[PDB]
Amino acid sequence: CKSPGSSCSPTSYNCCRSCNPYTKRCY
Numbered sequence: 001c002k003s004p005g006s007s008c009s010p011t012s013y014n015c016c017r018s019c020n021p022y023t024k025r026c027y
Contacts (some may be wrong), residue, residue, distance in 0.1 A: 002026050 001016040002008050004026045008019035015026030 002014050002019075004015065004017050006015065006026045007024055008014050008026050010019050010021040010024065013019050017027040019026050
């Protein structure tokens with residue numbers, strides 16, 4: 001995954017804790 005806080009794409013949700021759609025950053 002991507003680490004929390006990290007610059008990610010909203011729709012792919014490619015974080016361990018989902019990508020915040022508004023900020024492009026993992027919860």
